[PDB]
Symmetry: D4
Subunit: 205 residues, 8 copies
């Protein structure tokens, strides 16, 4: 599978004149106010990926952010709640047309309690995802080949996953439920940035 | 406190030609598929209330449901997640223009972890709510005077509470956050009815 | 006020030619293999009670046991799971026609999570039960007046509670459910005596 | 080895003129009000199995339901609490002559705390059960061969387990205990459907 | 009423030519290696008490220690596990003829789960113990009158408790059980001093 | 009680030519990145207090900040870990000569596990602190009298508590331990601001 | 490894004219009042073992009990708290001269938290113990070869462990501590049988 | 199978430790210094060799080792030094006050994980596999096994390399002064443990 590695930004959007784009990020951790965005990965669904190294203190990624703000393009994530938070924190733009495979799994894979990307890829696609590079130094000046291949593999399958989940959402008649969850997801990420990351805002207590 | 007690439905909407109505419910418990709607309470905010006794197996309430369907009329609840579920389950209409004082409290009363109606009324209004009649037989053929007064007092204050929360939401610049939460609330209630009542659909796990 | 205090057994069944008898016990604790039966209390529901001091090592009580054996007489308990175990363990007979007000509460008072005898008397009868003497030396040769009145008060109201609960079970169409629970309750008590007291036999784990 | 796959129902009862039938189900999850019945599996104990695909929306399965309601045929389950609830919810008939290998294990295999089907088959029968297909799309129009073999294996051994457990129940003199448990189990499943699925109805609290 | 306050040690043992002496201690906390012994209290059971202030760094108290070493006098404590440890740690002598009212309560008051001194005095003696001064500066040069009265109250009643507990231990035939617990209790206190204070040495894990 | 209420800053330092100043803050909550500083309170120990209302968005307070950075003036706090973080976060200066009565309590009141300000003032000074205004709108344009008196109450006694705690630290020879804890406290507060507020940095895990 | 299997009792004591005997039991579970003694295993330390099948209802085993009652012979167990309980419950004699390798491990292997027999055998002897047969039907009429070898292996090594543990206890100067623990252990087992099996009798609460 | 010098009681001299930083670890009979004695002290200069020092029961002095511990010009490197500092100070009466802890360093830099054990850190940063099998063993044995000795040495052979990497990360994320304050308080943290506060986060609200 072809992986294109970039510094800072995509050089252009030639490969992203499409209706939906798979998005993932790597960071120094789970706390966007502390842990910087280090890598953004994209795939058009054609078996190739773009891996974009983000510099310390980088405030701009023009072509990437054009995709993120384009209401005609659905941004596909796995657990987008996190990626939306770090992307909006880093570049100041909250994507608002999204699809999340973790939310979709929670709404359709009711026969299991494991909604991780690895389990979903294994079941739906007979694809083995390795999480070994997940805990590595994503801020390294030069990413290792293992790191680059891991980062790319997290976006290579989200299109195929979205297609299968859309089928299940239609079959079980939960399309409008999923859509409302995806519509609120960017606000759920904003709530995390604002200080409510540990609070289920809809809970009784 | 004037309290108009009705059987089944409001006689007409003469007292509710208004832009926002306070709504509450009494039931036989917290599980809408098991525990029937017993009472619906309404207030226009003029210090009076309508207490509507709902019969076992009752399927319609035309005037009430017209109110719940009116996009021009904001339905105010305290923890509307529950009331929206039981009203939609009982009469078949999910209100879609709502305001919840519990969500508003969680977004503004950041200096406490107590977001109950009693606490909010004591703090914001120096008004003492008693919960003694909360655990009583709300399916009784004839409600007691104590029950009627308790049921009415849960809607008598929601207009004033909402006015104060709107002030705080404006002060701390959280108006669009609250709006997104209220927009998703009916679907959060629907998710409860559909079987996800114990699941934070947005959580990692 | 009329509390008849007996040593060992009822003198006769003259006061219990009735359809249902309220039963309760006091012990040295919650473990029937260690904690002996100390007192058995009985009421016909007429506002009087019979309090029977059971001696250490007592193996028989023919009149009481005739009541417990009599299929035409329903034995009413609050949380009979306990009283059935210690009665069967002490006298060798397991009553098989029973009504439990705690199980009835759990099947009807779905609007609360408190199903203790004190809360139920307070809510259903506006009758105030004290538990101050519950923790006392029930094996003392001479029971105190406080002890005797406490023991009597635990049976004086079970008829009235059963009457209200049977209406509720009829209103919510759960009579057959309650009956099955009461039918298994003697076996749930045997399960406790046999060594499964800490196991919900129907749980997945 | 020999698995007969059917759409909708058994074609007739020619293979089930027997004293006891092994039964199992596959579903979209553990909540019958949300998660539909997808497969019912049957075995006469002769080392063959019938695997019946249940359509979305299917309200009748007349031959299967004849078996389920025939009081002269014991239905054998592993953790029948679940299967009874989904079968009664789907087709409206609660089987009432049952044997549950999980309850029987909890009454006899007191030397272990593991009462799952895989653990019981390994110990009692030296049969290796794989649970890999347990979390799969049981609503798929075409079940995979691995799904079909998994579903069949859950009923192929229940007669042999029952025979062994009956020997242990007799040896430890717990036959009447188990019988009472099996007699209540259909009402325990009914309690689950009615809204008490999280409540041990016999517990103190 | 009569409380004799001493610096360092009793002047003599003239008041303690008796079969049993009540003993208690006050400290700066629960960790004997950090928190010094501040006060030792004694009573003969005649309704008077001796309150002995222990100085920082004090290593001997010959009269007190002669009492504690005397095999012919039973030392009565409430929860002697603690007192034994700080006494042995401070003066180098571990008493080995003891009675503990907390252990005795746990072997006899099986009808409650509260085995604190206040609860036991309330139930068995109708005596009100206040623990208000328990958290106070016990190392103060001058103990307050409330501290002095509190420290004495902790030994004034132990003989009367021991007498009641010995009757219960006899009635329930647990005298040899209790004797074995008391015999091990000095070694349990030693175990705490040696570093096993958080470990139940007899537990499986 | 003379309470001087100010907008924005002290008008001058004429009352704070002293070696130690008592400091406290009120906020909209416990998260300094979300919850703004609303009130700063100061006392010289003379039984009077200054209560300074801090405006939304206020970036400087030159007289208050002069005291905070003055290395010759010890800043006394109760649980200064919090106040230090919100003061540094708001005005940009981390005080580094501090005394915390909560840390001092944990190092000296080893005979209790309650180290809150209310409990400490009760025990050490016989002063009753009310917490009723703690959960109130500290951002209000006009503070109520009850709010103002509460805010002043949290600084009026800190000098007296520090004097007592210093006596105890000397008595138990923990002065250098206390000093090292106070020296690290500003870095502990910084760690909180940087994103480690939920982490004990010195724990094994 | 020679393993002598017997029905009911040792035929004679010819192999046990020794100072110390290794003892273990197998049962139907961990609750002596419910789960019967099925097997008793003995070793003299010579690398051979005796495995004694205990029949259901068996009330005597004279030669075995002679060994258990003999104060000149130390009975070695691993976690004898359990074996002492079930032996005394079954044959009515509590062994009173014992050594427990789990208590010894807890007093000497302070560099670990794993005190199970497998861990101890592997570390101290480089001997691999398998627990695969631990959960099997020990009441089976004919024990499997695997069961017989498992049962023997639990006593084959206890002499060698005791010798090492005694060396550690001497080295760390804990011999009198261990001896007091061993002296109390039969009463600890008695406490279990009498109803205190879930209670640390020496705990504060 | 590296060069491991085994000594009884103390280093014979300081010839191998005229350096600015020394890697330090200990083995004991357990985690409670008042009960569980110091049994082994291990040292490395970072050159791929280690000294393993058996401490006798009751041993009160270790002059050469303690000279290193109190030398303010030498940084003592530990993994989770909170523990080693407590047992060393309890045994020989000197608390080292110039230290670097790789566990604190990991908690301040490897924010992308929740696993800060030495085995994980060595695997990730150095592709070095550490075995913990000998951790639970009789460290007070008169003669240590070969496996024990190699385990003890391996716990110090890599700390210099870890410290170098962590110092780069601390610089990169601008947390050097944060780390320095943590290391300066760590000896007092270990002292608090000895004094009776081992179970208490002294900076917590409750
Ligand atoms: N602290 C912590 N961070 C994680 C964990 N899992 C992932 N991360 C962080 O969050 C990012 C998520 O990336 P992904 O999981 O898509 O590889 C990682 O680059 C890593 O920095 C975890 O379990 N703990
Ligand atoms: N917010 C949050 N993220 C987690 C948690 N556990 C794992 N993660 C991270 O969230 C991402 C998605 O996890 P997955 O859904 O693939 O298990 C991964 O980077 C994973 O390491 C958690 O408990 N909370
Ligand atoms: N089971 C249960 N039901 C409650 C509880 N609190 C409130 N409810 C139910 O919720 C309904 C509405 O609550 P309310 O508006 O009275 O606060 C009540 O009529 C009552 O049936 C509770 O704590 N437990
Ligand atoms: N869903 C849910 N409702 C609760 C819970 N606890 C209390 N309630 C009910 O929810 C309603 C609102 O609670 P409040 O916010 O007034 O405390 C009341 O009827 C209260 O009894 C809970 O844990 N879950
Ligand atoms: N240990 C313990 N025993 C109790 C408790 N409550 C009741 N008991 C025991 O169980 C008996 C039940 O009697 P009742 O609750 O009807 O008064 C009492 O006589 C007493 O011996 C309890 O909370 N703890
Ligand atoms: N079996 C059992 N009984 C309890 C428990 N807690 C309290 N009890 C006792 O059970 C009896 C019934 O309590 P009630 O139903 O009146 O709350 C009382 O004696 C009470 O003290 C418990 O957790 N388990
Ligand atoms: N959510 C969830 N569903 C399960 C789990 N295990 C089994 N199921 C559901 O229960 C059905 C029956 O389980 P089975 O008989 O295959 O063990 C399965 O088809 C599946 O839908 C589980 O762990 N979680
Ligand atoms: N109700 C319930 N079902 C469970 C739970 N855990 C597993 N199950 C499912 O229930 C079924 C019982 O199978 P077992 O675990 O007894 O072999 C399986 O489908 C299993 O996955 C649980 O905690 N509760
Ligand atoms: N840390 C702490 N120490 C206590 C507590 N209760 C009692 N103590 C200490 O233990 C000593 C025992 O005294 P007594 O409880 O007999 O008055 C007291 O002097 C006090 O130092 C407690 O709850 N926490
Ligand atoms: N170990 C321990 N001792 C306590 C605790 N609380 C009080 N104590 C001590 O135990 C004795 C009596 O406690 P009581 O049984 O009255 O609660 C007193 O010496 C008291 O200081 C505790 O939580 N743990
Ligand atoms: N969320 C929350 N905030 C608190 C709590 N206690 C105090 N605060 C906040 O912390 C500030 C500290 O004020 P103080 O505790 O000194 O009165 C308060 O003004 C309030 O905003 C609490 O328990 N929960
Ligand atoms: N950081 C933190 N502060 C708390 C917590 N609980 C209460 N507080 C607040 O911290 C302040 C000091 O608490 P105090 O020591 O006076 O109890 C008060 O404002 C109190 O409400 C907590 O769990 N964590
Ligand atoms: N219920 C249960 N029983 C056990 C367990 N482990 C051992 N047993 C029982 O305890 C007896 C003695 O254990 P063993 O000496 O073989 O380790 C066994 O024969 C078995 O009946 C367990 O984990 N759970
Ligand atoms: N009483 C008790 N026994 C246990 C527990 N866990 C395991 N056992 C059983 O106790 C015996 C000794 O366990 P070991 O010390 O070898 O781990 C084994 O038969 C084991 O299965 C437990 O938590 N409590
Ligand atoms: N009790 C206990 N002690 C440990 C544990 N891990 C390490 N130790 C002790 O701590 C010492 C130092 O650990 P090391 O530096 O070998 O990792 C060991 O020699 C051992 O005594 C543990 O998990 N539990
Ligand atoms: N204080 C403490 N030490 C531990 C704990 N768990 C493991 N240790 C020991 O602390 C040392 C460091 O562990 P590591 O950081 O390498 O996981 C090892 O000797 C390890 O065995 C714990 O929970 N607390
Ligand atoms: Mg990701
Ligand atoms: Mg990724
Ligand atoms: Mg309501
Ligand atoms: Mg209401
Ligand atoms: Mg009762
Ligand atoms: Mg009673
Ligand atoms: Mg199944
Ligand atoms: Mg199945
Ligand atoms: Mg005391
Ligand atoms: Mg005292
Ligand atoms: Mg404050
Ligand atoms: Mg304050
Ligand atoms: Mg064993
Ligand atoms: Mg064994
Ligand atoms: Mg170490
Ligand atoms: Mg080591």
């Amino acid at each position: 599978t072809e992986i294109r590695v970039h510094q800072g930004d995509l050089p252009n959007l030639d490969n992203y004149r499409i209706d939906a784009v798979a998005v993932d990020t790597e960071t120094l951790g789970l706390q966007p106010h502390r842990d910087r965005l280090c890598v953004v990965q994209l795939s058009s669904g054609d078996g190739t990926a773009d891996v974009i190294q983000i510099a310390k203190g980088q405030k701009s990624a023009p072509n990437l952010v054009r995709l993120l703000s384009d209401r005609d393009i659905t941004k596909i994530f796995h657990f987008g709640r996190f990626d939306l938070a770090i992307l909006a924190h880093t570049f100041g733009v909250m994507p608002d047309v999204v699809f999340c495979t973790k939310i979709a799994s929670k709404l359709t894979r009711t026969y299991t309690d494991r909604h991780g990307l690895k389990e979903i890829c294994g079941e739906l696609l007979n694809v083995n995802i390795s999480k070994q590079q997940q805990s590595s130094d994503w801020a390294a000046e030069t990413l290792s080949r293992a790191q680059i291949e891991y980062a790319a593999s997290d976006v290579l399958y989200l299109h195929r996953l979205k297609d299968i989940f859309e089928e299940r959402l239609k079959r079980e008649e939960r399309e409008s439920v999923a859509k409302a969850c995806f519509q609120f997801l960017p606000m759920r990420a904003n709530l995390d940035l604002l200080g409510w990351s540990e609070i289920d805002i809809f809970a009784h207590s």
